[PDB]
Design a protein around this ligand. Sequence first.
Ligand SMILES: *[P@](=O)(OCC)N(C)C
Ligand SMILES: *[P@](=O)(OCC)N(C)C
Lengths: 535, 533
Amino acid sequence: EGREDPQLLVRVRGGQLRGIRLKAPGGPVSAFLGIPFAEPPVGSRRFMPPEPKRPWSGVLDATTFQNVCYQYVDTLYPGFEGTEMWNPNRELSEDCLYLNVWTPYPRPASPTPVLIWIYGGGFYSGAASLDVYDGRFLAQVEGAVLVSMNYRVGTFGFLALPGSREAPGNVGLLDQRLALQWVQENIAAFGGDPMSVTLFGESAGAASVGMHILSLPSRSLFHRAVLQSGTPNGPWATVSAGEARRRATLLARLVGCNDTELIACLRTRPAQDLVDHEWHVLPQESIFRFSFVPVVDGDFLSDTPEALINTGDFQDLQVLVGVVKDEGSYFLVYGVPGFSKDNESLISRAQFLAGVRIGVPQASDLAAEAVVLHYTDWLHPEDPTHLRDAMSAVVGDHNVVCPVAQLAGRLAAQGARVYAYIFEHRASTLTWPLWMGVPHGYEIEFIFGLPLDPSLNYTTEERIFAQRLMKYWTNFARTGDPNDPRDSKSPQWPPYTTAAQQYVSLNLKPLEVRRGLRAQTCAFWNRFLPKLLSA
Amino acid sequence: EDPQLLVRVRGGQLRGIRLKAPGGPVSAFLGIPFAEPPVGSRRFMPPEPKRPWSGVLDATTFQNVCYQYVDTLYPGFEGTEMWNPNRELSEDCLYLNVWTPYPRPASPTPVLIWIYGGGFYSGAASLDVYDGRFLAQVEGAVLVSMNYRVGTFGFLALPGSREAPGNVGLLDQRLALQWVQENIAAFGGDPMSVTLFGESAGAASVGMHILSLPSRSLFHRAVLQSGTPNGPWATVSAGEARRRATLLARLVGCNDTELIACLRTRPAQDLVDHEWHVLPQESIFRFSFVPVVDGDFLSDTPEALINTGDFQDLQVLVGVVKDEGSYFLVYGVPGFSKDNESLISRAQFLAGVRIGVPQASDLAAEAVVLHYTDWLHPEDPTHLRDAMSAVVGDHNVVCPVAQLAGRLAAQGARVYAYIFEHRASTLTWPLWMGVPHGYEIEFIFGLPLDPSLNYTTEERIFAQRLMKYWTNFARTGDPNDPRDSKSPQWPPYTTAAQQYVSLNLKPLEVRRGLRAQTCAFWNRFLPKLLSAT
Ligand SMILES: *[P@](=O)(OCC)N(C)C
Ligand SMILES: *[P@](=O)(OCC)N(C)C
């Protein structure tokens, strides 16, 4: 050193880092990108828990995003922004256990609340380095310290032979945990406050956040939580030990491969081979089902999430949870026949009954009859616009909206402070057709405040709206309360409670308060439908 | 010695009485016998035609009420008493009444035939609310009502036996309908335009004449008020009828022939004493002796018969009241009384549902609870009390009606449907019960036109409307008033549009779908649940 920017040299437990000064709309930020937090999980370490990163010599260059974890790359719609935005934007490699830090410039003198992002991607994709997770705006505008990590997805992060030493499963969850530990020990170097760490994540990121809520060793590593459109409970976020064993051994068969012999053989397989067969192991044709997800191992997850939400003590917990207007529309184009991004997708009753078997793949004939009976509009039972929307509702409700209600309910009753939202604003830029409304993931760019970049084409009300949301989020991280402590003018977001079940609408209009989160419909999914699966 | 009051029917001569209605005189022929008294060896037997009589039979007074249970739940309360027998009980009860305009119509007049309800265990054609003087006078209708056997006497069956074949109460009705084909012309009725109407078990009876071929030649149109032949309460299987019959026998100290002989030796009231101890479960809106699927009167189940029948040349008017379920809650659901407001608890609601849906398995019971609970206020007692009412009304009346209306329309019938929402000002039941079943009858019959009865002046205008709808329906097959416009028309009920009208003080409002979501539950899902316990 000697001739370079003094604000950009930091020491962490493993060594020296050089960050980069970055432009935000309203001024500069500090970014430290691609800080390794684990030994590269390669070679004999594939399928295994992360090991802490051994110290390095010299000044590690932390000025660019690092590798993205090895994963499936979607190609359904080439050139199409709506899908491309989620695709890896750095080299795919198994050597991907890196994390990123954004802080103000200059770094703050007093310790600042830390927000840690956990990306979604169904546990088979994702990357901390996508544009919509750019931490600079929350860093520049709200003075937050934002941290995001890569964690292993797909087989690499989730293939499990439960009980074995060499593939215990949940290791992707462990990468996340290791990055949380890294934050505890090192964030202060950046002016972060380790005693004020808030996890936020969306979809599998949200289910991830909830796993950490439910898993004791993770508990001491954060104080507050945000789950956007995802839950640790529900039909897709976990598999049983048996089922995980089953998918793992099938995948092994499909590629050539006593648990030791099998795993050892899997370890000799090229990464692309596992990705090529990843999708062939699901018990039924489905949507919103993923092959390698967190397992109920009786270790990380001591019991099913359903059990742990019911019987856990959430005394100390402030939690923000919510959903987008159309949780189910996105995946309809991936595998319900009838549906497409390129037309209105008006479907028939026949296509709807078939769609229900696909969106609720674990349902018997009777259970499905019940779904179809519930969501049919008996005045207009053949009406293709309603059917198309009912198909979206089934998928959205079953996988997200009702799980979120089950979670919000149990948490509030076990003594947690819960704030709930439904996000209803469709981006003016959005490239999915109108019929899809607000698909999951499309609140993210607002929360992170991307509309503040005047080069991005958002409307002026969208720029103001983004600021509102960044304020809710960072207020929540600061205090456990999304409300602005002075500003009593603006309508208050009340806690969600079992008695009143209040939540707010997030759109361009001021906060409006509503009651019951699809209460009638969720009684179907959460209370009735389980029992109809004891017959 | 008025010649207007003197008529020769096929069996001989009758002398009527001149009665007064608010706007003029009416000729009444009360207690005309249409069958041999069904007594002694005729108990449980089909009715035989009344033998001809000498001289002039006095038909100026209501005859006896068929032998039946009498309600004593709230002794001296007008709400219950208005349904109790207003004449002596007797097995000698097969009589009918005819009201006609005074003087007797110049040309053949459409006939309405009324069939009382009472759960097939009670009722009488002589109650004040079935008084036909108003329809006869104001609208010029020829109105006929008959007594039919009820309880064990009308409905006890040992199916297959010669001596108690079941459905005789219904055959009583059919014989009274035959009597009308043969005799109504003498009173200036048109036997070629006969319209049945009935309420509750009476509506079910109307529905069975629809589904029973030999009855079809005896009327041309039907009105079913708050009841249907299909659904949980109106029929029983042969197996189940045999079961209750043999159990009633055992209970009163008694091979088919031998068993019936013994039953015939018992005093009427001994049978009635044990009428209510034969039901398989604690229940409400369930009744021991009801029509039986006998392969004779009813060739198959009413469900089977409405799914496949051909109803091309049939006009039908069907409807329900706003609160079909409130009435029976006080008769055996803990927490319910007419005296307080019956704000019930959640536990009372779950136990109330096993009583309201007695044939429901544990899982089906739960589906119902989970459906009818308002999840925004799971434990509010007002909601829970109203949901209880709705479970019972929906399961027993509204959804069966929706089902019938759909089937009839799909299979060629011309159907009109209604919900009745006006609570009578004079009603003596508490407000929480709303509009209980049967409290439309007094309006259709035109009782508010009696200045002495203390109905509001709006209620009188309402009653006039209703009488016009019903009699227009009898005249033409269509309840709409030709002379009259814009304001608005009553559209036929169809499977596509599902249009019905609200009947209340405001002008007709057209609505679509009759508890459409909730009836999909009862009519489509619930059978599947139970079938797979
Ligand atoms: P989420 O992670 O969204 C991206 C696939 N999810 C739908 C589980
Ligand atoms: P309806 O006949 O009325 C009985 C008092 N019924 C509810 C079956």
